[PDB]
Design a protein around this motif. Structure first.
Motif, PDB file in Angstrom:
ATOM      1  N   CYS A 230      47.030  39.083  45.915  1.00 17.40           N
ATOM      2  CA  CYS A 230      47.859  40.281  45.820  1.00 17.40           C
ATOM      3  C   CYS A 230      48.169  40.864  47.202  1.00 17.40           C
ATOM      4  O   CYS A 230      48.232  42.088  47.365  1.00 17.40           O
ATOM      5  CB  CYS A 230      47.192  41.337  44.920  1.00 17.40           C
ATOM      6  SG  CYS A 230      48.391  42.614  44.275  1.00 17.40           S
ATOM      7  N   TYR A 263      38.023  37.791  41.286  1.00 16.87           N
ATOM      8  CA  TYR A 263      38.408  37.518  39.896  1.00 16.87           C
ATOM      9  C   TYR A 263      37.316  37.937  38.915  1.00 16.87           C
ATOM     10  O   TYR A 263      37.616  38.457  37.838  1.00 16.87           O
ATOM     11  CB  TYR A 263      38.735  36.039  39.684  1.00 16.87           C
ATOM     12  CG  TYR A 263      40.072  35.633  40.229  1.00 16.87           C
ATOM     13  CD1 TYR A 263      41.101  36.542  40.312  1.00 16.87           C
ATOM     14  CD2 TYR A 263      40.316  34.321  40.625  1.00 16.87           C
ATOM     15  CE1 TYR A 263      42.336  36.169  40.808  1.00 16.87           C
ATOM     16  CE2 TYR A 263      41.543  33.936  41.113  1.00 16.87           C
ATOM     17  CZ  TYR A 263      42.544  34.869  41.212  1.00 16.87           C
ATOM     18  OH  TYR A 263      43.768  34.504  41.694  1.00 16.87           O
ATOM     19  N   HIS A 266      37.515  41.684  38.694  1.00 17.67           N
ATOM     20  CA  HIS A 266      38.646  42.177  37.911  1.00 17.67           C
ATOM     21  C   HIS A 266      38.403  41.977  36.426  1.00 17.67           C
ATOM     22  O   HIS A 266      38.728  42.847  35.616  1.00 17.67           O
ATOM     23  CB  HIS A 266      39.937  41.494  38.358  1.00 17.67           C
ATOM     24  CG  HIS A 266      40.615  42.193  39.494  1.00 17.67           C
ATOM     25  ND1 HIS A 266      40.037  42.323  40.739  1.00 17.67           N
ATOM     26  CD2 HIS A 266      41.801  42.841  39.562  1.00 17.67           C
ATOM     27  CE1 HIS A 266      40.848  42.997  41.533  1.00 17.67           C
ATOM     28  NE2 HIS A 266      41.929  43.319  40.845  1.00 17.67           N
ATOM     29  N   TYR A 267      37.817  40.837  36.063  1.00 20.42           N
ATOM     30  CA  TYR A 267      37.315  40.621  34.713  1.00 20.42           C
ATOM     31  C   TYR A 267      36.385  41.766  34.283  1.00 20.42           C
ATOM     32  O   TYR A 267      36.607  42.417  33.252  1.00 20.42           O
ATOM     33  CB  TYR A 267      36.614  39.254  34.697  1.00 20.42           C
ATOM     34  CG  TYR A 267      35.929  38.809  33.421  1.00 20.42           C
ATOM     35  CD1 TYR A 267      36.284  39.316  32.167  1.00 20.42           C
ATOM     36  CD2 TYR A 267      34.907  37.878  33.478  1.00 20.42           C
ATOM     37  CE1 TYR A 267      35.629  38.894  31.009  1.00 20.42           C
ATOM     38  CE2 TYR A 267      34.251  37.452  32.326  1.00 20.42           C
ATOM     39  CZ  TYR A 267      34.610  37.968  31.103  1.00 20.42           C
ATOM     40  OH  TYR A 267      33.940  37.521  29.984  1.00 20.42           O
ATOM     41  N   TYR A 274      41.318  38.355  32.716  1.00 17.81           N
ATOM     42  CA  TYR A 274      40.996  37.732  33.987  1.00 17.81           C
ATOM     43  C   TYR A 274      39.954  36.634  33.860  1.00 17.81           C
ATOM     44  O   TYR A 274      39.689  35.932  34.841  1.00 17.81           O
ATOM     45  CB  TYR A 274      40.494  38.793  34.972  1.00 17.81           C
ATOM     46  CG  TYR A 274      41.581  39.633  35.610  1.00 17.81           C
ATOM     47  CD1 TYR A 274      42.320  39.151  36.688  1.00 17.81           C
ATOM     48  CD2 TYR A 274      41.878  40.901  35.134  1.00 17.81           C
ATOM     49  CE1 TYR A 274      43.313  39.914  37.271  1.00 17.81           C
ATOM     50  CE2 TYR A 274      42.873  41.679  35.720  1.00 17.81           C
ATOM     51  CZ  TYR A 274      43.580  41.179  36.784  1.00 17.81           C
ATOM     52  OH  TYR A 274      44.553  41.949  37.374  1.00 17.81           O
ATOM     53  N   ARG A 275      39.372  36.455  32.677  1.00 16.29           N
ATOM     54  CA  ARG A 275      38.296  35.488  32.538  1.00 16.29           C
ATOM     55  C   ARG A 275      38.778  34.051  32.744  1.00 16.29           C
ATOM     56  O   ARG A 275      38.024  33.218  33.253  1.00 16.29           O
ATOM     57  CB  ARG A 275      37.628  35.652  31.175  1.00 16.29           C
ATOM     58  CG  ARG A 275      36.509  34.649  30.951  1.00 16.29           C
ATOM     59  CD  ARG A 275      36.092  34.575  29.519  1.00 16.29           C
ATOM     60  NE  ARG A 275      34.890  33.758  29.363  1.00 16.29           N
ATOM     61  CZ  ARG A 275      34.908  32.464  29.050  1.00 16.29           C
ATOM     62  NH1 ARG A 275      36.068  31.846  28.861  1.00 16.29           N
ATOM     63  NH2 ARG A 275      33.768  31.790  28.922  1.00 16.29           N
ATOM     64  N   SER A 277      41.114  32.907  34.813  1.00 16.76           N
ATOM     65  CA  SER A 277      41.189  32.667  36.253  1.00 16.76           C
ATOM     66  C   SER A 277      39.820  32.364  36.838  1.00 16.76           C
ATOM     67  O   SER A 277      39.664  31.428  37.628  1.00 16.76           O
ATOM     68  CB  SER A 277      41.796  33.873  36.963  1.00 16.76           C
ATOM     69  OG  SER A 277      43.133  34.082  36.563  1.00 16.76           O
TER      70      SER A 277
ATOM     71  N   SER B 198      49.767  39.843  37.393  1.00 17.67           N
ATOM     72  CA  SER B 198      48.519  39.270  36.865  1.00 17.67           C
ATOM     73  C   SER B 198      47.852  40.159  35.825  1.00 17.67           C
ATOM     74  O   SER B 198      47.263  39.657  34.867  1.00 17.67           O
ATOM     75  CB  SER B 198      47.525  39.011  37.998  1.00 17.67           C
ATOM     76  OG  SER B 198      47.845  37.798  38.649  1.00 17.67           O
ATOM     77  N   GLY B 199      47.863  41.478  36.038  1.00 17.85           N
ATOM     78  CA  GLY B 199      47.228  42.377  35.096  1.00 17.85           C
ATOM     79  C   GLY B 199      47.882  42.437  33.722  1.00 17.85           C
ATOM     80  O   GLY B 199      47.270  42.979  32.803  1.00 17.85           O
ATOM     81  N   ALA B 202      47.678  37.134  30.073  1.00 17.24           N
ATOM     82  CA  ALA B 202      46.372  36.749  29.553  1.00 17.24           C
ATOM     83  C   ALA B 202      46.529  35.450  28.784  1.00 17.24           C
ATOM     84  O   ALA B 202      47.645  34.967  28.574  1.00 17.24           O
ATOM     85  CB  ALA B 202      45.776  37.866  28.685  1.00 17.24           C
TER      86      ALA B 202
END
Ligand SMILES: Nc1ncnc2c1ncn2[C@@H]1O[C@H](COP(=O)(O)OP(=O)(O)O)[C@@H](O)[C@H]1O
Ligand SMILES: Nc1ncnc2c1ncn2[C@@H]1O[C@H](COP(=O)(O)OP(=O)(O)O)[C@@H](O)[C@H]1O
Ligand SMILES: [Cl-]
Ligand SMILES: [Cl-]
Lengths: 289, 289
Positions: A230, A263, A266-267, A274-275, A277, B198-199, B202
């Motif tokens: 990002c 990552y 963020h998860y 995010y899991r 990734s 990204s957010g 999923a």
């Protein structure tokens, strides 16, 4: 209760058996103070205790003292009597129209290089990465520090929040088989910003870079690229960076290892979207190893 | 009051003439409701009126009806009697093991292709991009819609919040000289997600993509890549996308023009640290033209 009302009429349910809730926190208030002696920048949050702003203040202070990349001079952090916490720092006028990606990479590398410690990997206090605690107890081996206080903490936290024992087990296989990724290179502690993405970078009136909102500690310099997904870092950023801090064997091989920490964070902060990734990265390293 | 106290203790000031504040909102509460009729996903926010969630529900519904990329089926949005708003939608179990990029590009291109309208560029209602209003008044010319209701709206807002008349003037120079970037190509309205990073992406149990939190409208398909700087789109993403959708002349030339809308929005939402990215893009186009 219109939510309950809809669920028991139209949703075709007769009973609600469980409600699990996340989120709901309040964002910092950011304020410009205008006084006859110039401006000051202040951030308040009535819901959060003072630990977060104190870690930010000590992070800004340690990066300020390297005298390399420009950061706001911090003045005071503490507790609000009404409830909550605050921080006071230097006010900086952002918006340099040109910007300078190479200057950012050069100045960042100067900070990694100038910021040194005799205490090893870690930091004087624990702080936070986002809202997640970041454990900073001093350690003398980087592979030990990163596996335990970075990957290991985040994995255990995901197992407790989501019952995700699969990522916990596969992750700990990785942590145990991690050493070949480091190719016997020697690793010096460097002062890291710790959370470096687009929202934390700005340019002042001289079009010089300014970085904000740290999660500082002393670590492997390459770990400061772990938010690059990002950041929009170009080739001019990296080539100016590596001119001051040359690229070490295994640099490309480890990039995902340092993304993986963020990552996982963020998860743990923003949910299981995010899991994949994180799990994708863990699977590849297990294959490669 | 330690802030005022410090400003007059160590800050060496004697009068505070103004205090300008941004931020301070509270984020959404996100809830998993388990019932005897299965699960539901609920978001609430006690501070905000229902316009934002109502726009989200209609965006989901439009994407849902194309029958291409998976999105949560929306059920109901409205106002909380206590104050604030809610939305109820389908609950989906996230956590895809590998994650799947090419499938994301395929499914997204199919949504652009299937989602059509006879009314031109725009949408049934105004909605929001983040918290900023997104004006969706129907228009038949894309250059006109994008120049006025996207870039131009953001420029006016930036002039009003910051007194940034420079970005406003250079901005309207670009808007008036914009047509050569389009190389006379004909532009078909496509259903856009409108905030694809990204957010908002999923993966479900079959490792199929799911997209969330839209800011939908009918527009140029290329504008859906305007958040790519925080999206992590791989090369397999674009390879799968352009298999479904033919690439039009000037695609590379226009990429920054669609990033620019989001840089301006981020400037307006999160502060002048983002002003340099926007100005740099505007400067390059003024040169190039
Ligand atoms: N349809 C859904 N089903 C299940 N979980 C969801 C759904 N939409 C969002 N979530 C989860 O809810 C949490 C926050 O949702 P998000 O889409 O970020 O809402 P907001 O933008 O208001 O924060 C995350 O943990 C995310 O994984
Ligand atoms: N030292 C500073 N001087 C002037 N403005 C600042 C400073 N630090 C942050 N800002 C501005 O304050 C707002 C919020 O800052 P940010 O660093 O995102 O704080 P937080 O992440 O805690 O909300 C942004 O508009 C940013 O431009
Ligand atoms: Cl982020
Ligand atoms: Cl973002």
């Amino acid at each position: 209760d219109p939510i309950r009302e809809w669920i028991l009429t139209e949703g075709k349910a007769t009973q609600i058996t469980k409600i699990g809730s996340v989120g709901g926190g309040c964002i910092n208030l950011a304020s410009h103070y205008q006084t006859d002696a110039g401006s000051f920048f202040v951030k308040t949050n009535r819901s959060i205790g003072p630990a977060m702003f104190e870690g930010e203040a000590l992070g800004l202070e340690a990066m300020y003292e390297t005298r390399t990349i420009r950061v706001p001079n911090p003045h005071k952090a503490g507790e609000l009597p009404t409830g909550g916490s605050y921080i006071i720092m230097e006010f900086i006028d952002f918006g340099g129209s040109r910007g300078n990606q190479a200057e950012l990479g050069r100045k960042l590398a100067e900070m990694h290089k100038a910021g040194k410690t005799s205490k090893g990997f870690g930091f004087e206090v624990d702080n936070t990465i986002g809202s997640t605690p970041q454990i900073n107890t001093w350690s003398s081996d980087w592979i030990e520090f990163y596996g335990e206080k970075r990957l290991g903490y985040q994995l255990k936290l995901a197992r407790d929040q989501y019952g995700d024992s699969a990522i916990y087990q596969k992750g700990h296989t990785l942590i145990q088989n991690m050493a070949p990724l480091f190719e016997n290179v020697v690793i010096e502690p460097c002062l890291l910003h710790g959370d470096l993405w687009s929202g934390n970078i700005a340019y002042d009136k001289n079009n010089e870079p300014v970085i904000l909102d740290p999660a500082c500690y002393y670590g492997h310099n390459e770990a400061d690229f772990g938010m690059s997904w990002c950041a929009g870092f170009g080739e001019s950023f990296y080539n100016a960076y590596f001119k001051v801090m040359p690229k070490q064997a295994g640099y490309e091989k480890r990039r995902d290892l340092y993304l993986l920490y963020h990552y996982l964070n963020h998860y743990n902060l923003f949910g299981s979207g995010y899991r994949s990734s994180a799990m994708s990265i863990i699977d590849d390293y297990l294959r490669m190893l």
